[PDB]
Amino acid sequence: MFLPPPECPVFEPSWEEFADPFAFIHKIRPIAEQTGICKVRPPPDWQPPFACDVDKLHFTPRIQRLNELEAQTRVKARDYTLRTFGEMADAFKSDYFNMPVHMVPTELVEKEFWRLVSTIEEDVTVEYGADIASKEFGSGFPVRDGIKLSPEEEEYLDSGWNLNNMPVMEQSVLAHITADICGMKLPWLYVGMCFSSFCWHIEDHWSYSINYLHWGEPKTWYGVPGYAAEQLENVMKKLAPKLFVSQPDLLHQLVTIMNPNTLMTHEVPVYRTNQCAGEFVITFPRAYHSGFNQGFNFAEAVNFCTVDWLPLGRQCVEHYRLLHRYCVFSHDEMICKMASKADVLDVVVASTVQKDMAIMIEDEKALRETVRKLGVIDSERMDFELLPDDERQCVKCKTTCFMSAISCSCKPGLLVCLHHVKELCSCPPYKYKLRYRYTLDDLYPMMNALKLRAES
Ligand SMILES: NCCc1cnn(-c2nccc3c(=O)[nH]cnc23)c1
Ligand SMILES: [Mn+2]
Ligand SMILES: [Mn+2]
Ligand SMILES: [Zn+2]
Q: Concatenated DSSP letters for 156-205?
A: SSS-TTSTTTGGGSTT-SGGG--S--HHHHS-EEEEE-TT-EEEEE--GG
Breaks (C-N over 2.5 A) in the chain follow: 76, 146
d(CA 351, CA 156): 31
Question: Under a CB-based contact definition with an 8 Å cutoff, are residues 411 and 396 in contact?
Answer: no
Ligand 1 pocket member 161 (CB < 6 A): no
- Among all bound ligands, the one having the nearest atom to the CA of 66 is 2
Which of 209, 294, 296, when mutated, tests ligand 1's pocket best, judged by the most ligand atoms within 8 Å of its CB?
209
Q: Is the CB of 272 under 6 A from ligand 1?
A: no
For ligand 1, mutation pick of 62, 188, 254 (most atoms within 8 Å of CB): 188
CA end-to-end distance (rounded Å), the chain: 60
Q: 1-327 has which CATH code?
A: 2.60.120.650
- State the method: X-ray
183 lines ligand 1 (CB under 6 A): yes
Q: Where are the domains of the chain?
A: 1-327, 328-456
Residues contributing to the annotated binding site? 128, 201, 203, 209, 211, 219, 289
Q: 130 in ligand 1 pocket by Cβ < 6 Å?
A: yes
219 CB under 6 A from ligand 1?
yes
Alpha carbons 266 and 277: distance in angstroms, whole number? 33
Which ligand 1 atom is the nearest neighbour of the CA of 293?
14
Long-range contacts of 439-446 (CB under 8 A, 24+ apart): 439/381, 440/361, 440/364, 440/365, 440/368, 443/357, 443/361, 443/364, 444/361, 446/336, 446/339, 446/340, 446/342, 446/357
Phi, psi of 310 (to 5 degrees): -40, -50
C-alpha–C-alpha distance, residues 164 and 140, integer Å: 10
62 within 8 A of 130, measured Cβ to Cβ: yes
Measure the CA–CA gap between 159 and 49, rounded to whole angstroms.
Answer: 13
297 pairs with which residues across the strands? Answer: 192, 216
Cα(29)–Cα(111) distance, integer angstroms: 31
Q: What single-letter amino acid sits at 351?
A: S
d(CA 376, CA 233): 39
**β-strands 125-133, 188-192: how paired?**
antiparallel
| Resolution in Å, one decimal place | 2.3
Q: Among residues 6, 37, 109, which one has the least CA distance to residue 66?
A: 109
CB atoms within 10 A of CB 263: 24
Q: Is the shortest distance between the CB of 289 and ligand 1 below 6 Å?
A: yes
What is the position in ligand 1's atom list of the atom closest to the CA of 196?
15
DSSP, collapsed to helix, strand or coil, labels residue 103 as helix
Cβ–Cβ < 8 Å for 330, 400: yes
Distance 123 CA to ligand 2 centre (A): 5
The DSSP line for 407-435 is EESSSTT--B-TT-GGGS-SS-GGGEEEE
Residue type, 339: A
Number of neighbouring beta carbons within 10 Å of residue 292: 27
Q: How far is Cα 202 from Cα 284, in angstroms, rounded to an integer? A: 9
Asked whether 160 and 166 are in contact (CB, 8 A), the reply is yes
From CA 289, how far away is CA 223, in angstroms rounded?
4
94: closest CA among 86, 104, 79, 84? 104
How do beta strands 378-381 and 432-436 pair? parallel
Query: Comparing C-alpha atoms, which of 405, 314, 306, 329 is closest to residue 360?
Result: 314
